[PDB]
Structures are given as structure tokens and as C-alpha cells.
């Protein structure tokens, strides 16, 4: 049988049963909530820094940690030594995966900007697996609505990410963007930054003079480099010690709503009063992960 969906090269024909995957760049956490580890050969080595890959992958001697690089990642032939059905893909190098695709192996090519198109792109990769992802979708944009419903008459606070210095930020066509807004952050990196994320000088991070400052899952920095950063000493952000590591989740996937619950929580949160977060959180990973109620205890907040 086969199935066809479309992706960043356009129309794909993916064979199936779909036994073999690898996952490169990014949907790190997509086996995890399909629980569809056994049908994993690869995966960036970046994922099993996941605290819902650590948890959920139960076998991971097996698993080939591959290159996280954008992209010329561990090339062509570790790829046919692995032998996968399909490889899954971010896109940082169009070129480089243009190439891959001429070896006969499929490949499955995204490049999410947004949670939505992070939803869309999960929704064709579970025609490809053959599993049903409409409830654990549900679950996804029930979240969504409820952060929105929250910050409803709730002015954004100005605050920006940093990634793998303290002068590199996101701005349009970036899904860390679109987490930042969706948790109620006017992210100033919009300004300067027309694609993706940047370096932008110091001068002109001191001058927008961020309320808040959240730091990248992945990056080098603590929020102990920043605070201490001398050349920061003048911004808002650091006065009032708002700034912020974001929690061990990937976001190219299936836990992007909370990574803004996150955000909203550390800069909103008084839009939160009475709410019971961890219920929100608990029922979270029982729907989307299928985890039972010890398993779900490490992954509350606090």
C-alpha cells in the first residue's frame, strides 16, 4: 500500500508499512507520543537530551545517535548502512537533503514555522506510521486555546530568545518565534530579524531593553551567564532577574503548547491565579504520552 501527502518538495509517495525511520533535526518527541520507538534506527543526538525521549525510549543501545548539524548531517552512507524506510527531516540545508533524496531512500521534508504547521507536519507523519493522531492533536490545540483564553486582554511583554550566544535571536519565519508569541512575548528579534534566527549587536539588544529573556533548551548559556553578562547590566530583563532556561523540550513537536504555557506561566502570571496548572500538565502527558500516574510525577512543574 502506499500513501501520498505533501511536504516541502511538494507531493511525496511514501510506501508502506513504514518500518525503519530515521528522525533528523527535529519531531524528536513524535516516536514518543505514537510510541513507535521500535521503528526508530536514528536519531539526532541532540534528542536524547529530551526528558520524554529519556523516559519513554526504553531501549536507546539500539538507536544510532546521528549528526544535529544544519544540516550535511552524517551523510549518505551512514544512511544506507542504516537502511530506513523514510527519513524524517528538518530542513536547515535544502541542498544537502535535495542530494540524500537521489539515493532511492524516502524522504519526509518539513520546515515548521508554527504550532500549527508543527500539528500539520505531525498529522502527515502519522499517515505515513499508520496511527490515529486526532485525539493527541485535540489535546495539542485544546491547549492552545487555553493559554489564548488566558492572555485575552493581557498586554505582551517585551522580551526576546537567545540561542547559541547571547546576540543571537529569533525573528519572522521561526518556530521559536511563534512558541514566544503564543505566550504572550512581543518579541523584539521581529525587528531585525527577517528569517529564522541571527546575531543582532549588543547595542541594539541594550537599546529594545527586553522585560524578559528566555534562553533556547539547547544553548550554551545559564540564565547565570546572562544576568552576570556585564554588557547587560542596564537591561530591565536583568534588574528584575527575569530571565529564563526553557524546560529539556523539542520544539519541533508534540510538546511545543507547553513550552508557551511555559513562557505565558513565567511572564503572565497573574493570568493564572487561580488555575491548577499541574492538572493541566498531568493530563497533558496522559493523553498526548500515554504515561501512567508514576510516570507522569517528574514531569510536573516545581
Same mark, same amino acid.
Given at each position: 500500500?502506499?500513501?501520498?501527502?505533501?511536504?516541502?518538495?511538494?507531493?511525496?509517495?511514501?510506501?508502506?508499512?513504514?518500518?525503519?525511520?530515521?528522525?533528523?533535526?527535529?519531531?524528536?518527541?513524535?516516536?514518543?507520543?505514537?510510541?513507535?520507538?521500535?521503528?526508530?534506527?536514528?536519531?539526532?543526538?541532540?534528542?536524547?537530551?529530551?526528558?520524554?525521549? #529519556?523516559?519513554?525510549?526504553?531501549?536507546?543501545?539500539?538507536? #544510532? =545517535?546521528?549528526?544535529?548539524?544544519?544540516?550535511?548531517?552524517?551523510?549518505?552512507?551512514?544512511?544506507?548502512?542504516?537502511?530506513?524506510?523514510?527519513?524524517?527531516?528538518?530542513?536547515?540545508? =535544502?541542498?544537502?537533503?535535495?542530494?540524500?533524496?537521489?539515493?532511492?531512500?524516502?524522504?519526509?521534508?518539513?520546515?515548521?514555522?508554527?504550532?500549527?504547521?508543527?500539528?500539520?507536519?505531525?498529522?502527515?507523519?502519522?499517515?505515513?506510521?499508520?496511527?490515529?493522531?486526532?485525539?493527541?492533536?485535540? #489535546?495539542?490545540?485544546?491547549?492552545?486555546?487555553?493559554?489564548?483564553?488566558?492572555?485575552?486582554?493581557?498586554?505582551?511583554?517585551?522580551?526576546?530568545?537567545?540561542?547559541?550566544?547571547?546576540?543571537?535571536?529569533?525573528?519572522?519565519?521561526?518556530?521559536?518565534?511563534?512558541?514566544?508569541?503564543?505566550?504572550?512575548?512581543?518579541?523584539?528579534?521581529?525587528?531585525?530579524?527577517?528569517?529564522?534566527?541571527?546575531?543582532?549587536?549588543?547595542?541594539?539588544?541594550?537599546?529594545?531593553?527586553?522585560?524578559?529573556?528566555?534562553?533556547?533548551?539547547?544553548? =550554551?548559556?545559564?540564565?547565570?551567564?546572562?544576568?552576570?553578562?556585564?554588557?547587560?547590566?542596564?537591561?530591565?530583563?536583568?534588574?528584575?532577574?527575569?530571565?529564563? #532556561?526553557? =524546560?529539556?523540550?523539542?520544539?519541533?513537536?508534540?510538546?511545543?503548547?507547553?513550552?508557551?504555557?511555559?513562557?505565558?506561566?513565567?511572564?503572565?502570571?497573574?493570568?493564572?491565579?487561580?488555575?491548577?496548572?499541574?492538572?493541566?500538565?498531568?493530563?497533558?502527558?496522559?493523553?498526548?504520552?500515554?504515561?501512567?500516574?508514576?510516570?507522569?510525577?517528574?514531569?510536573?512543574?516545581?
Amino acid at each position: 500500500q502506499e500513501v501520498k501527502v505533501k511536504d516541502y518538495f511538494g507531493e511525496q509517495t511514501i510506501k508502506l508499512p513504514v518500518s525503519k525511520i530515521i528522525y533528523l533535526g527535529s519531531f524528536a518527541e513524535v516516536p514518543a507520543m505514537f510510541h513507535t520507538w521500535d521503528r526508530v534506527v536514528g536519531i539526532s543526538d541532540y534528542a536524547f537530551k529530551s526528558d520524554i525521549v #529519556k523516559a519513554t525510549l526504553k531501549d536507546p543501545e539500539r538507536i #544510532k =545517535p546521528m549528526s544535529s548539524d544544519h544540516a550535511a548531517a552524517l551523510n549518505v552512507e551512514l544512511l544506507k548502512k542504516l537502511s530506513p524506510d523514510l527519513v524524517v527531516t528538518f530542513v536547515g540545508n =535544502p541542498k544537502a537533503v535535495e542530494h540524500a533524496k537521489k539515493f532511492g531512500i524516502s524522504f519526509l521534508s518539513f520546515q515548521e514555522k508554527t504550532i500549527a504547521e508543527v500539528m500539520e507536519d505531525i498529522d502527515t507523519q502519522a499517515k505515513a506510521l499508520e496511527v490515529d493522531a486526532s485525539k493527541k492533536l485535540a #489535546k495539542m490545540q485544546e491547549t492552545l486555546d487555553f493559554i489564548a483564553e488566558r492572555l485575552k486582554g493581557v498586554k505582551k511583554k517585551k522580551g526576546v530568545e537567545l540561542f547559541h550566544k547571547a546576540n543571537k535571536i529569533s525573528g519572522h519565519q521561526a518556530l521559536d518565534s511563534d512558541i514566544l508569541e503564543k505566550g504572550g512575548i512581543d518579541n523584539f528579534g521581529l525587528k531585525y530579524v527577517k528569517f529564522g534566527r541571527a546575531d543582532i549587536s549588543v547595542e541594539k539588544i541594550v537599546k529594545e531593553n527586553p522585560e524578559i529573556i528566555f534562553i533556547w533548551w539547547i544553548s =550554551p548559556l545559564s540564565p547565570e551567564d546572562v544576568l552576570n553578562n556585564p554588557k547587560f547590566a542596564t537591561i530591565k530583563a536583568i534588574k528584575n532577574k527575569q530571565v529564563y #532556561k526553557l =524546560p529539556t523540550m523539542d520544539i519541533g513537536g508534540p510538546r511545543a503548547p507547553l513550552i508557551s504555557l511555559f513562557i505565558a506561566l513565567k511572564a503572565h502570571p497573574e493570568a493564572f491565579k487561580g488555575v491548577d496548572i499541574n492538572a493541566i500538565v498531568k493530563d497533558y502527558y496522559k493523553v498526548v504520552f500515554d504515561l501512567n500516574d508514576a510516570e507522569v510525577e517528574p514531569f510536573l512543574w516545581h
